[PDB]
Each structure stands twice: as C-alpha cells, then as structure tokens.
Amino acid sequence: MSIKVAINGFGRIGRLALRQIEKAHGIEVAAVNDLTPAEMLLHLFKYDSTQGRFQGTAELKDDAIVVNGREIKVFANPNPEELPWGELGVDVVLECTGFFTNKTKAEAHIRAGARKVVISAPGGNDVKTVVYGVNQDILDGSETVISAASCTTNCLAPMAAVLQKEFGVVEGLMTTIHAYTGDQNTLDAPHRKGDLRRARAAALNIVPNSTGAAKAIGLVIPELNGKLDGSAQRVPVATGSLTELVSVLERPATKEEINAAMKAASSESYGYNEDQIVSSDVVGIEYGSLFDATQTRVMTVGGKQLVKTVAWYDNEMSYTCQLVRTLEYFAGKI
Amino acid sequence: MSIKVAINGFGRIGRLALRQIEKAHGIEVAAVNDLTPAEMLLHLFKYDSTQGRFQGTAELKDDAIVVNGREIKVFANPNPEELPWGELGVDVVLECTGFFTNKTKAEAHIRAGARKVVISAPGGNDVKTVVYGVNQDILDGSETVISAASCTTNCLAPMAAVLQKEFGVVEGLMTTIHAYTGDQNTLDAPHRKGDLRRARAAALNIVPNSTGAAKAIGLVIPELNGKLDGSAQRVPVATGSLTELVSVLERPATKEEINAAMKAASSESYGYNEDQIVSSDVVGIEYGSLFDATQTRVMTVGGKQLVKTVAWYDNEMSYTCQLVRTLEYFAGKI
Amino acid sequence: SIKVAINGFGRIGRLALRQIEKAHGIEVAAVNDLTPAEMLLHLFKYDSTQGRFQGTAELKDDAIVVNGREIKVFANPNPEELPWGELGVDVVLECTGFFTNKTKAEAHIRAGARKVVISAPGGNDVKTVVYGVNQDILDGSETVISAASCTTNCLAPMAAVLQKEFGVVEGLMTTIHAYTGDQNTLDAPHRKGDLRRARAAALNIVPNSTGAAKAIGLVIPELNGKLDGSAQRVPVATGSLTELVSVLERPATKEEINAAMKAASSESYGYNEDQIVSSDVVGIEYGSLFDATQTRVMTVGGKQLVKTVAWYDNEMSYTCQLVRTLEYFAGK
Amino acid sequence: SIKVAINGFGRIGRLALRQIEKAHGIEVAAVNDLTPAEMLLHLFKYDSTQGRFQGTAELKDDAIVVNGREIKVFANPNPEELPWGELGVDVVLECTGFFTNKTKAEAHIRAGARKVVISAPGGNDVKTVVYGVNQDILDGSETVISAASCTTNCLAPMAAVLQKEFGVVEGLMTTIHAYTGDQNTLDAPHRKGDLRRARAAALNIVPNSTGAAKAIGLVIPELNGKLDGSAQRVPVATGSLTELVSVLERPATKEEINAAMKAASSESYGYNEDQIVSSDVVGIEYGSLFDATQTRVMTVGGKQLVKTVAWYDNEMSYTCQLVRTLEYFAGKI
C-alpha cells in the first residue's frame, strides 16, 4: 500500500515536488489542486525557465495529467475543504499555496479527508518545524500538521548547528542574498501585502526585505533560540541564493577549524564546497544547503573574534528536495 | 478654469500621466482611484525603477496625496460607477486599469458623473481611436469615450502613414520587439488570462505574444485597413521597445527616399534619429515614436522590393505623452 | 573510432567536448588553447547558461581527464607544430577564428590531421555545409570545410523548405539573438569599433548586422541573392529565434507551410507546436527548431507575405550541428 | 581656473566630465583613451545606466566640443608620451585602473602634469581621501593622491560616526555591489585569472574580494586594523549598498545610531528613511546614503551586534566624491 500524496498549489515548489516524488519510492502523487485549468498546469510542469524541461512524459487527459503513464487527478477549487481528499483516500497533502501556512487552515485538508498535511513554508509556533538532517527525529507520526520551514531555514540550520555544537554561539546576524520570488512584482506596481519594496521591479533592484529564518531558528535548534536575527536582500537572479552568518563564538576558532567542522557534518542535505562557484552553479542542487569554505572568514581584533560563514542554496530545488525528504520520513512514522 | 482629470488605475501609465499632466498647462488631476491604500500610491509615484525619481514634492494627507502643494483625492473603489466624479466635477477620466477597455465598461465612469473618458488601451471598433499627430482631427468633441490605442500603435502609425502617403502600401508584416510588462509573470506561474507565454518568467525569456496594433491600424489609418498584421516578441528590458515593418510598396523606393520622407514627417510626436542608439536611449523620450534611419533597408530582387522600416518607442513614457496630447486636444473640444 | 582535436577551447569548443563525450564512435584526443588549463577546466565544469558538466573533469599534469580519459592540452599558436599525426587525429574543429581560410586551416593537415571543420564561415576556397541541408555536396576529397555561422544553421533548413516547396522571390530576416561575448558588459569602448555592441549587453535591445542572409547562396544556391537580414540582440545569455518575412513564387497557406516543415523534420531540424519561449530552447540538440505557432500567411488582394520563425540555441544547437558535420566529414 | 585631464574615458572618466562641467573653477582640457574620437563622443552622449547627457556634444577634428568648448582627444596608452606639458594641465584624473600606484602615476608628472588623482586605491604610500571625512590631511604639496574605492566612500562616513559616538572593537563588511566592467559578459577566460569574474556578470551572484575595509586606516586612522570585508556582485548595472556588522565599545540603541548618522549628514553623507531600492539610488550625488530602515541591534545577554547599511551609486556617488576631492585639492595646490 504505497503512500498517496496530493499537492495543493502547483507553484514552483509544488511542481518541483512532483518531479522529485516521481523518483521517490513508496510515494506517488494522486492529485494536484490549483486554481487554473489543467492545460496550463501541464505546460508549466513540462517547461521550466530556471529548472529545465521535465525529463519524462507529460500528457493531457480530460481533467487530469498523465505523468510517465500514470494519471493524476487535477482540481481547481480554491477552498481546501471542498477538495475530495477523502474520496481519494490521500495520506498527505503538500500545502504549497502560501495561503494556508497555519495549523487551523491546514486542518481544512483534514476536514476534506486528508490524513496529514505538510506545509511548504513556516507554519507558526503551534506546528512542528523540521529541517531534514537537523531535527527530523522530533517527528513521531502522530502530528496532523507539520512544517518544513523556510528555504533560508534549511540553508542556515545545518551551518548554525555545527557552529553551536563545536564552538558555541553567543549571537549572530544573518544576511541572505536571495533570488527574486513570486511575491515581488514584475514592474513597479501596488503590492497585495502592502510591502513598498516587494512592490518594486524584481529584476531591476537590490530589494531589502525582512526574513524570520534567524529568529525562528529556535524551533529547529533549541540551543540557538534567541541568539540570531536576520535580514534579506533580494537580487536579480531567477533562482539561486546564499546565506551569510556573522556570529560571535563562545570558544575561539580558526577558519580552517570551521571549514573542517562543516566538512565532517556534510550529508545528503549539507554539502561541502571548495571550488570558486557562483549562483548559477547552485541551480538544481539537491542539497538543502551547500557550505562554501572559500567564503569562511575569521577576524581577530585584540583577541576578539568575528566569524563569517556562508552557505549556498537553490531556494527552489534545495528546499524542494528537503521537503520531499521530510515527506518520506513523515510517511514512515505516519 | 482649467480642465479637470481623474485617473482610474495608478499603474505605470496612470502614474506617468500624472507627471506629464502637472507639466501641461490648462489640465490638472483632481483625483486618482486605485484599489490600493494611499501610502503605497504615494511611494510608487515618488520612486521609479525605470523612469527615475519624481521631480517634485509629493506628500500624504488623510485620504489624499498633495503633489506640488495641491491636494489630489484618493479613492480605493474597484467599481467605476461608485466613484464620485460628479461631486468632484471631473471633466475627463483616464481609464488606465486595463480592466475596463471597451465602450460599455468605460461608460460606468460617465454614470458616476464624468463627462468624458479616454481609454489607455484599444477599446475596439465602437469607440474612436486616435494617435496624436495622425488622426486627432477625427474628434469633434461629441464623443463620450475615446481610445488613445496601444503604445505599439502610436509607434507604427506615423511610420506607416508616411509609407502610405508617399509610396502606397500593398501589405505589411509587423514584428515589435517589446519590453516586458506587468501582464507577464515574474517567474513561471499560472496566468490569469490563460496565456501560456505571459505565464513565463518575464526577465528570462524571449516571449512571443500577440499584438493587434497591426490589424486595427485601420481605425487610425483607414487607407491601410486590412493591409497589415503583426506579432510581438517580449524581451528582458524593463522598458524601451522598437517596431519593425516589412512592407511591399506600390511605387519603387530607395532607402534614402524613405529616410527623407520620415524626416519631413517629423513632429513633436514623431522623431527622426540618425545615431546608433539602443533601447536604453529611448527611455524617457517624450516622442510617441522615434524613427531610426540607420535600420531602414530596401531589398530589390528582379525589381521586386521588400522594405524594412524601424522605429523606437518607450512603451511607458512615449505612450503616456501621446495619451496626454490626445487628452488636451479632446479637452479643448469636449 | 573518430579522433578529434579542438583548436580553441572557447564556448563552442567546450560544449563540443561535452557533446562528443556523449557521442559514440567519436572522442576528443586533444585540445590546444593558449589559456591556462586551470581556467579552461573551470569553464568546462561550470556553465551559467548550460549548467554543470555531467561527468568527471580533473586536471593531471599537462592534460585534463574527462570521464577517466586523458586529453592532451596544448598551447602552441602554430597548428603545424602540434602532433596531430602522432595522436592519430582525424578531424580538427577550428574554433579560434584565426585560421578561417583554406591555407591557414591546412596547417592542421600538415600537422597530420586528415580534415578540418571551421566553426565560422570560411572564405571563397572552402565549402560551406549545414548538416541536414547540403552535406551531400561533399565528395570526401576536401581537406577543409566550413560549418557556417550558428544563424545560418537556423535559417538554412527553414529557407530550403520554402524554396523547394513554394519558391522564394525575396526575403528579409530578423533574428532576435542572445547577447554575446563581443558585446560589452557595461558601456565602454569597443575593440571592433561597433557603437552598439559597445553598449551594455544585458540592458539593451541592440541592433546589429548579420551576414547569414547574404551568404545563404553557399548553402542553398537557388536562394542566392534572394535574402537580406539584420539582427536584434536582446538580454538573454543564450537562446534565439530567426524570423523570415518572404515573398513566395507560388501561393501558400499557413497549414501547408507548417506541414512542410514537419515533413522536413530530422535530427537537425525539429518541429514544435507547443507555446515555448527562449529558455525552453536552451540546450536543444536541433540545429533549428521550427515554430508552427508563429507561422502567419498574409493575403491582401491576392498578394501574399509570409512569416516563418525558427528557434535555435546559438551555443548548443550550433555545437550539435558542428558535431554532426564533424563525424560525417570524417567518414566519407 | 584649474585645468584637468582625464586619463581613461571609462564610466568614471565620462561621469567625471559631466560633473566637472557643472563645477566652477575647473575645466577638462583633454581626455586620453585608447579609442577613436568618434566612439568616445557616442559613449559620452548616451548612457544605459545614467541617461543621455544633458548638454551639447559635437565632434571636431581630433576633439570634442562639450557645451561649446573644445576638449583635445588623445589615444596614447603610455602616459609619459601624453602632451600634458604643452596643454599646461594642472591635474590628471587617472581613471583607467591600470596606473593605480604612485610609481605608475608619476608618468603623468613626467609628461608635464603637476598632480595626479587616482580614481581607485593607489596604495598606502599615497594620501587617500574620502571627502567629508579626511579631506583636511591634504596640504597641496602632494604629487599623487587617491580618492579611494567607491565602497570606501560609502563605508567611511558610516564607520566614522560609529567610531566617534560608540567606538568600534571590530567589524565585518559585506557590500552587495553592482557588476562592473572587469566581469565578463558571458563565461569566458578572465584577464587577471579570477575564476569568479570570469563568469557572466548578469546571470550570477559573484563573490569577490574587496580591500575597502582593511584600508580604512588610511581614511580613519582610529579604525586601522578593526575592519575587514568581502563583496557579493549581483546583476544590477549600477547601484550598491554596504552592510557593517560591528561590535561597539559602548552599548547602543538603533534610535541612537540613526540619530547619529542624521547629525553627520552633509553633501557627501545622506540620510534616508524611505523604503528605497537600488534603482532609487542611481544618479545620486551623495558619496554615501545611510538607510535608517536597515539599522538593527541584536542584544543577547547584554552582548551587542550592530548592523548599519548605506546605499551608494558606485558610478555617480564615487564620481561626485572624486570631483569634490579634486576641487579641494586644487584650492590647496
């Protein structure tokens, strides 16, 4: 009995999740719901400006899409409760719309008949937050709604964990230079949420914006709670991002010690890089985070240290792969 | 007393229209209506990624914006009929939202109490269509709703006019390489109108798209009706465009004859250029169209001729300046 | 197995090594470039438009090891001194642009290479071949041929179909083209003197000349003198399309034209009906990809004007066409 | 009046001519670049990032006429061969980027120029000046000075305020910076061998080193050795910002920091409270523009980490600072 998945919101994250889940074993995507006709969804899945064509068969059947010979039901109801996840017997729902990133709203899928919900973004203090390779253990399968956190959280968390475990962290400020995203406008225009800076043209500007990945780091690594705060700078790349962390450490450290600590911590989720890469090189990586040893810097002024550690991540593909990893692990327990 | 104007849709065209109207004499903007809070509108009027900062004073008063010391009432009603144009005593309304681009929808402004309406886009066959400097004479002031046509039409019209008058046109195909616009998405995502190509990330792609500026050219130049059709290629420039016309002429022509005719036709609306300019040079021009003599090409094979003529235009500012010119001329007679 | 040497490890040369590694019966024995090997390895491994190389690439003393196989690296500016005979080289891809004529290219034959293919137009003494259009004109006796420009490989298959099926009186070509290295990053003086390539490539629509239309006679003789064209450079690092507005001898319908291109589809010439954009054409292996969605036939008083549009990745499509011509010329 | 020659009619050289025309008591007698006069005029008239030149520019035989005044044009790559002596040029603006040290700059003095100002860091033996911070150190006796890098002119006023009001223990600087000429249009070999500037400028976030922070000692001696930084080049043709995460000696609140920067405002150092973006800073005449919105103070256990951010137009902001240093240096010389 293979786990059944439905994807709510066939956006960048939802669509890439279908690509990765197809390769995954024990999981298949029974249905997708998005407020657009199925013809549009098929096109956007087949062709991709940043991630390349889907390496597989994609065809259109009436009210459905056939991916590699398997039909996937398509729905367009904006209200989650109305969706027939119960009639489909779906096990888990990927909440990728960005409008139901909270415990109560995610439960609407449970009312529709879905057993569990995983949110493709932060979901508040009431739901569990998981960065794979850091705190996947906390899941026991009993939770109805969990959150895979933000893309920046999946990039920062492994890097911050190593600094805390090996040297201890007093405090840190995080600056993430981030690719532009959907909430930004194509050209200067009114913004739905009221942000005067996302209202501005995404591809023309360095755009300051807030991010909570550092403050909310407490939900992933409790030992780091309250020690980090951060900001963001959105820049004209359609995908590909990096995370800088200026941190004060409890124990003194050398740039070689830090890089060696990260290399030991490398996993399927956390990569170690020594080449002189740039953002385009990170597009499509499956790591949730890619630590760049070249960017490590330790500065010592009068026996006082300030440390910069940097990790690349593809806000789209890196997060998606971490999302699928958390989805598989959550199925084993659930 | 001065002509009083209200702007519906404080978008790229609506906001630039406010800039040009301040400089214009005998015309002022009494109010703007947009489904945005005034705080956002003031900001987007003051700061511009492509057209530069507004050269003037702009401040926020309760439910209004004060531009150069003069109050402008701000409303946020999406339904045009509900706006109080009668109360404010508004001579003309600029329909710049892009959602009311036809005679019937535009009439909601007249119901609200506005005397006249000018549509910042094509409005079909039922309303008069005017490219200033080509057919403004057709207006007698009796019309309730008129259209300034598309930005592409204001570029194509003066160039095609010279060709028809001097050489005569059998037929022509138009290709306009056009800056990306709001109707395109920032990143691959479903599109509201269902266009699979405007759905694609605007800043990453050459995006073929339809344009009716060539077919509807009959409403501007009746002598050319049915003789032209064209398409568009949207490319990653935030503003600045050009229009090519490959045309068969009735009388034989040389490249020098064509350039001389266009220079003779030059006006405030139609410029003549001999420098080797590029798209960025056209940003902020006040001409509705700028003929590029350098790109003109006449090809003869066995006495059969094919002619290429090219003209630059800033889809935002060039169209906005033509829009104001038609707004004044229509206001003198209205 | 065909043994190939690449003179000039630029973007085309590097992508050619990627495509040749995938190809069976053909391998790259050596590359000669005056650039340091540490840099050449980096640009081979990492590509901003074409992505990471799907393979192993490491540097060993005086060579680079691609998928476990040594490839000799040389830095001699004089091709004749290179040991093409010792390595057993069959064909040379001349991608430097400095040996683009019969005599200079022959220096590779003196070095021991059997034949040479130039990745740019080659002059009045060498044959010009767009694979899938006129490879037949080769009789195997030639030492040096030219694969023409990337733009020629996009225009040629589409124009050949029009000439054979309907006949062409005349045509004008406009190619909306990705920006290229010769354009400056930011406004600055330009080496060749072009006031428009001097302008910042990623910020502008940049008119510029193209000779693909005039030279079409070398590929399709019956189209000689019937075509003229220009180019518009737009801010995409790769991916392009070619429009051709043409007057045809015989009347045609858009369905007739699209059906004809579909019949002409091959490994080199693709036929597309989806609503694609430039990013979708990046990395395609077709030399040209005809877009049926953009076809338009205009009739006004019995007089017709026809527009046909074909995509091509100026980098990869030309590279794959170059490899197709490279093997075919080695076999005859 | 003061006579100026521009060696290198690049982005900085051309913008310097625009600002120098507006300046009084200074005029540009000649420009030298390894380009034909036809090309130099075109690039002076038309600008993709800074807009068309608001003035008259025409071509005369071997010269360009800006606002009706002839400016002799030269194309000699060796400064020594240039005729600065015949032209009696008081100062030379070294904007090529190929003569950025005292020894190479002296070639202009051999050619007959009295003084040279380098539009970049010219080493730690030459006096280095950020206008509005340490212009006083110049007494006019120097033959070669440096106006420093664009990032230095952004960081210097902000760092000086922090040093005076709260004192600085140490700081790390990260500048998100517009791409520049030394980066390649498309992936290709790089002249200096930089594997990252070799990559296509408009497609990538490109880490790169910058010495603006370490050299801060030449501008603010009090800060010597306390700052180091790196840069991230991102795809904007112009417009930049500088972040500084710093440990302060005395505790501070974000409101205290913002108030201090506003008090320090001048023609060179601006204060901004709007939610601006990079395009908004294009064309500004400030050398640096402090963004109060971005200030942040992080206190964990009474241990403070402070972030201060300032925008700058790497082209125009530096050029206006360069002209300001040129005027002051011409009064003293």
Ligand SMILES: NC(=O)c1ccc[n+]([C@@H]2O[C@H](COP(=O)([O-])OP(=O)(O)OC[C@H]3O[C@@H](n4cnc5c(N)ncnc54)[C@H](O)[C@@H]3O)[C@@H](O)[C@H]2O)c1
């Ligand atoms: N892509 C990233 O950089 C990234 C990284 C991490 C997390 N996220 C999170 O992912 C979510 C959005 O992902 P994205 O940015 O790829 O999405 P997106 O911007 O492409 O749009 C989301 C999709 O959901 C659909 N949708 C909207 N409302 C809906 C509704 N009521 N019912 C059904 N479908 C609906 C939209 O049509 C669209 O197809 C957000 O929560 C965001 O924080 C995004």
Ligand SMILES: NC(=O)c1ccc[n+]([C@@H]2O[C@H](COP(=O)([O-])OP(=O)(O)OC[C@H]3O[C@@H](n4cnc5c(N)ncnc54)[C@H](O)[C@@H]3O)[C@@H](O)[C@H]2O)c1
């Ligand atoms: N931008 C150009 O190059 C250009 C050129 C010529 C014509 N136009 C025409 O101008 C119109 C809009 O142009 P744009 O691209 O600047 O628009 P835009 O993308 O800036 O947005 C239009 C504005 O209308 C507002 N709006 C939307 N629905 C509304 C409603 N119901 N009531 C009130 N306000 C509403 C939006 O909030 C926004 O401020 C379109 O019809 C377009 O065809 C644009």
Ligand SMILES: NC(=O)c1ccc[n+]([C@@H]2O[C@H](COP(=O)([O-])OP(=O)(O)OC[C@H]3O[C@@H](n4cnc5c(N)ncnc54)[C@H](O)[C@@H]3O)[C@@H](O)[C@H]2O)c1
């Ligand atoms: N561009 C910026 O944002 C910026 C900011 C601050 C400082 N600078 C400094 O200004 C200098 C140049 O910057 P840029 O980017 O404006 O330059 P640029 O890249 O536009 O070119 C400078 C000019 O110098 C010319 N040149 C080169 N070698 C020459 C020689 N031997 N003789 C004469 N002319 C020669 C070039 O042809 C070009 O016209 C560098 O020192 C740079 O660090 C630049």
Ligand code: NA
């Ligand atoms: Na092989």
Ligand code: NA
């Ligand atoms: Na002066």
